[PDB]
Structures are given as C-alpha cells and as structure tokens.
Amino acid sequence: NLPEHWTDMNHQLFCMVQLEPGQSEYNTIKDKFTRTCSSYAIEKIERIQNAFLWQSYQVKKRQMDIKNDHKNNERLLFHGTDADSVPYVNQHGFNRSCAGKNAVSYGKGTYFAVDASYSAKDTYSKPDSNGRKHMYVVRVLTGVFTKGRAGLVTPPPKNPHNPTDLFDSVTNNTRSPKLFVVFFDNQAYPEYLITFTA
Amino acid sequence: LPEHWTDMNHQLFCMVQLEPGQSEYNTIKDKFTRTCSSYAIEKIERIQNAFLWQSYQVKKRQMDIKNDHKNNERLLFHGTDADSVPYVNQHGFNRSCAGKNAVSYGKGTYFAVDASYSAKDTYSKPDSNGRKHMYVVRVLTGVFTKGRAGLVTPPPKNPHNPTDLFDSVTNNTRSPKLFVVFFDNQAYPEYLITFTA
Ligand SMILES: CCOc1ccc2c(=O)[nH]c3sccc3c2c1
Numbered sequence: 344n345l346p347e348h349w350t351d352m353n354h355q356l357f358c359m360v361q362l363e364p365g366q367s368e369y370n371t372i373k374d375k376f377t378r379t380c381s382s383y384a385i386e387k388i389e390r391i392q393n394a395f396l397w398q399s400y401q402v403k404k405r406q407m408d409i410k411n412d413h414k415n416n417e418r419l420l421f422h423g424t425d426a427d428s429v430p431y432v433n434q435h436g437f438n439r440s441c442a443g444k445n446a447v448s449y450g451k452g453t454y455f456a457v458d459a460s461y462s463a464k465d466t467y468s469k470p471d472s473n474g475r476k477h478m479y480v481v482r483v484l485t486g487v488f489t490k491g492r493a494g495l496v497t498p499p500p501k502n503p504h505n506p507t508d509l510f511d512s513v514t515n516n517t518r519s520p521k522l523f524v525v526f527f528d529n530q531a532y533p534e535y536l537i538t539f540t541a
Numbered sequence: 542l543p544e545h546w547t548d549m550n551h552q553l554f555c556m557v558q559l560e561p562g563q564s565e566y567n568t569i570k571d572k573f574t575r576t577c578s579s580y581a582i583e584k585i586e587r588i589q590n591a592f593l594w595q596s597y598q599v600k601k602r603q604m605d606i607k608n609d610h611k612n613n614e615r616l617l618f619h620g621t622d623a624d625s626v627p628y629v630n631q632h633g634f635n636r637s638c639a640g641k642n643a644v645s646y647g648k649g650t651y652f653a654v655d656a657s658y659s660a661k662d663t664y665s666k667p668d669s670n671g672r673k674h675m676y677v678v679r680v681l682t683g684v685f686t687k688g689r690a691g692l693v694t695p696p697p698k699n700p701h702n703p704t705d706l707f708d709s710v711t712n713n714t715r716s717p718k719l720f721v722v723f724f725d726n727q728a729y730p731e732y733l734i735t736f737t738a
Contacts, residue, residue, distance in 0.1 A: 356606075395603045395607075398599055398603070399596065399599055399600070399603075399726070402595055402596055402599050403596070406592045406595070406596075409553075430703070430704050431703075431704055434704040435694075435704065435706075438693070438694070439637065440636065440637075440648060440693040440694070440723070441693060451637065496635075496637040496638060497632075497635065497637065497638070506627065506628070507627045507628055507630075507631045507632065509632075526637065527725055528724055528725040528726065529596070529725070529726070
C-alpha cells in the first residue's frame with residue numbers, strides 16, 4: 344500500500360529522503376512551519392519512508408474512517424523532540440510510555456501541536472550539541488475529540504454509561520484546539536523531520 | 542477474518558459462547574485444565590473483534606518478515622478483574638492500564654504460560670458473585686530475552702544497533718513461565734473463560 348510518490352527503497356523497509364527547496368512538497372512544509380516560527384531557519388526537511396509504521400497507521404486510519412461518520416479524522420501536526428529520540432521515532436514512531444509531562448497536561452499520552460511555535464520551545468525540540476533543533480510533521484488520527492484532563496491514560500468515554508466507546512483523542516480546548524493527545528500506538532505517522540537552527 | 546469465526550450480520554464485534562463438548566470448546570478447556578482442573582468452567586466465549594484481529598495480523602506479518610522465520614506466536618493466559626473485561630474484549634491489552642501487579646520484568650502487559658498463574662485472585666479477581674475471568678491470548682512473543690524492572694520497551698538485540706529490539710521479555714529464556722509485550726496489537730484476546738474456585 345506504499346504511496347507511489349515515495350522513492351524506490353529497493354526491498355528495504357526504511358529510508359529518510361532529503362527534500363529540495365523549490366518543490367511544492369518542501370515549500371508547503373516550510374510555509375506551515377514559518378507561519379508561527381519565522382525567527383528560526385530550516386537546515387533541511389526529510390520525508391520519512393517507514394513501510395511498517397505506514398501500514399499499521401493506514402489500518403488504524405481505515406478503522407477510524409469506518410467507525411466515525413464521514414469525519415476528517417486526520418490532522419497534520421508538529422512534534423518537537425530531542426536528538427537522542429530521533430532514531431527511535433524514525434523506526435518505531437511515537438511511544439506514550441516515553442512521553443514527557445507537558446507544562447499543561449490534558450492526559451498521559453503523546454502531544455502534537457497545531458503551531459510549530461509550540462513544538463519549537465527548547466523544552467520539546469532540545470538543541471543538540473551542534474545547536475540543531477528537530478521537529479516532526481505528523482499525520483495524527485485526532486478523530487472525534489473532547490477537552491482532556493491530567494488524569495487520563497486513555498481518551499475518555501463519549502458516554503459515562505458506555506465506558507468502552509471512547510473519543511479518539513483529547514485537546515486543550517475544543518473551540519480552538521492548539522494541542523492534541525493520543526493514547527495508542529500507530530495513531531500518528533511521523534511523515535517529515537525538520538532540522539532547524541536559530 | 543478466520544474460518545472458525547461464525548457470521549456477525551456485518552457487525553465488527555461479537556462474543557460467541559462455545560457449546561460444551563464440541564472440538565473448539567474441548568481444545569480450549571484442555572489448555573486450562575492442564576493446571577486448573579480444580580476450577581469449574583461456567584463458560585468459554587470466542588472473541589470476534591475484526592479491528593483487533595486486523596491490527597494483530599498486520600503486526601504478525603511484519604514480525605514474520607523482520608525475524609525472517611515464523612514461530613513468532615504463542616498461546617498464553619491473562620487473568621483480569623470483571624471491570625476490565627469489556628475494555629479488553631473491545632480494545633485488547635493496554636500497558637497504560639496495568640497496576641502494581643504488572644511489575645518486575647517491565648512496564649508492559651503480562652501473559653502466563655500456565656493458567657494456574659493467571660488463576661491467582663490478585664490477577665483474575667473474583668467478582669461480587671465469585672466469578673473469575675481469564676483470556677486465552679495469541680501473543681507475538683517473537684525473539685525474547687530476560688526482562689528486568691523498569692523496561693519501557695524490550696532491550697536491543699545488540700547495543701551497537703539500539704533500535705533493532707527483542708519482541709518480548711520473559712522471567713527465564715530457557716524455561717519461560719511469563720512474557721511481557723510493550724506494544725499495542727502484539728496480543729489478540731481469542732477466548733474468555735469464566736470460572737470459579
Ligand atoms: C510477575 C507478574 O506476572 C504476571 C503474570 C500473569 C498476569 C495475568 O495473567 N494478569 C495480570 S493483571 C495484572 C498483572 C497480571 C499478570 C502478571
């Protein structure tokens with residue numbers, strides 16, 4: 344099911360592909376980033392081609408598309424991370440068990456930002472020994488969501504008398520969402536890695 | 542969707558009570574009675590969860606490719622309290638839900654080789670009516686190593702490639718009595734046994 348615009352990977356399962364400025368693919372990511380992070384400068388943007396993460400993510404997307412009633416289930420969001428975590432995320436994706444406590448907690452899961460400026464905080468995208476910061480652009484299955492709460496280890500039930508029928512994700516604010524939290528593996532696909540500097 | 546499943550009238554989730562004395566019920570009963578013959582089986586249900594099955598079978602194919610052989614799958618037991626049964630039937634096994642009982646070999650979901658281990662009251666807690674609950678689980682144990690307290694993922698299969706991981710951890714690699722998996726969709730709950738002491 345691998346997208347036909349991916350580079351041939353030669354029976355390999357994983358590749359990072361460096362994008363070229365001037366191509367729509369690079370430019371649209373650069374614009375979405377500079378919308379809120381105009382003070383930073385992009386070193387490079389890599390497309391993440393991970394066959395196994397993509398398959399598991401696309402199965403979860405198909406299931407959420409079946410379960411929800413013609414919803415836009417998927418948002419393109421940002422995730423800042425430290426250099427030490429990039430090889431793990433590239434290969435294995437986002438693991439809630441490794442997640443940091445966010446300054447404002449809406450549950451114990453993986454946090455994704457609407458605005459690059461949030462992900463660009465040194466607390467999330469820690470500068471490496473060479474001053475480089477790292478941010479993923481991520482396809483996230485936000486689905487149907489509600490305002491979260493610090494206590495959550497899964498999304499809350501839509502109905503308290505049906506505890507197993509869950510919201511797909513939670514947010515800080517349902518009228519103006521600026522962050523989303525997901526609580527399951529393969530609910531987020533790391534699509535691009537932005538390397539950037541002051 | 543597997544053969545031994547029965548029709549679901551286009552539904553994606555059904556719990557199907559097995560008939561005592563037919564081959565499927567007899568096979569699952571015998572796996573339990575190997576170590577739990579002193580317990581009384583009230584019923585066995587086949588868990589038909591299309592989404593959990595799909596995600597599990599994807600992970601199974603991936604592990605068959607990664608390990609370059611089959612034999613990544615084992616049948617194991619998981620005792621749970623009555624309150625968690627609806628969650629497990631619909632959403633499977635969540636390492637984030639595991640309390641202080643799921644400790645010692647890592648922060649994952651624990652599966653027992655022997656039904657006797659899962660039959661302990663600390664795991665299969667008797668409900669107000671005295672009923673205990675244990676799953677028979679298809680688990681992708683794959684290539685495993687000894688676990689230790691505090692693991693959030695299995696160790697690497699070589700500290701020179703830190704991201705190529707073991708699939709699971711155990712108490713004992715030569716004679717395993719339990720397995721811990723650290724990822725969703727590595728365990729498919731196949732049967733639920735309701736039983737009493
Ligand atoms: C060393 C602990 O190993 C095990 C082995 C089996 C089980 C089990 O069947 N159910 C549950 S529910 C919470 C913990 C456990 C558990 C833990």
